[PDB]
Amino acid sequence: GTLDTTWKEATLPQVKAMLEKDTGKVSGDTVTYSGKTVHVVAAAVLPGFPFPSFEVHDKKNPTLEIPAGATVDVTFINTNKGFGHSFDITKKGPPYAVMPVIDPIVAGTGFSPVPKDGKFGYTNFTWHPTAGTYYYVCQIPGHAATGLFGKIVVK
Numbered sequence: 001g002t003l004d005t006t007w008k009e010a011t012l013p014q015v016k017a018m019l020e021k022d023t024g025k026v027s028g029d030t031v032t033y034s035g036k037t038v039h040v041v042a043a044a045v046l047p048g049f050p051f052p053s054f055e056v057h058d059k060k061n062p063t064l065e066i067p068a069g070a071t072v073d074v075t076f077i078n079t080n081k082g083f084g085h086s087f088d089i090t091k092k093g094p095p096y097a098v099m100p101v102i103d104p105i106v107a108g109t110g111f112s113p114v115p116k117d118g119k120f121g122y123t124n125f126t127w128h129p130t131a132g133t134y135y136y137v138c139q140i141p142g143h144a145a146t147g148l149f150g151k152i153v154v155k
């Protein structure tokens with residue numbers, strides 16, 4: 001397939017507005033989405049959160065519960081200075097090797113731009129999942145191995 005390798009730029013307040021567009025409901029460490037079309041907004045290492053992690057709806061690496069047959073619009077933002085993290089959805093689960101074995105990637109991005117001059121790289125892609133469990137992971141060597149992944153349950 002093709003990975004999403006095209007990115008836009010957002011200042012911090014734009015990043016924050018976008019994060020607030022996530023349509024999920026938080027419960028504990030889970031984010032549950034409902035409806036025909038859902039909007040997942042994920043960020044790589046929001047300030048104040050542990051490295052390395054993804055934040056979705058203000059939670060760290062949460063399990064995303066998505067309805068089978070939904071159109072999933074994912075916005076991925078990299079807010080972590082010094083890194084070009086990716087966001088890739090795969091059926092291969094953890095733990096991951098330093099070079100993570102995650103092919104085939106069912107939907108996702110290439111490496112993001114590193115933050116520069118108050119601007120953060122972000123991108124939008126769409127996913128049409130069938131029922132199953134998937135994981136969202138970064139491909140930068142060692143990141144997935146050190147905790148940069150989360151789970152998705154589609155049902």
Ligand SMILES: [Cu+2]
Binds near residue numbers: 052083084086138143
């Ligand atoms: Cu990474």
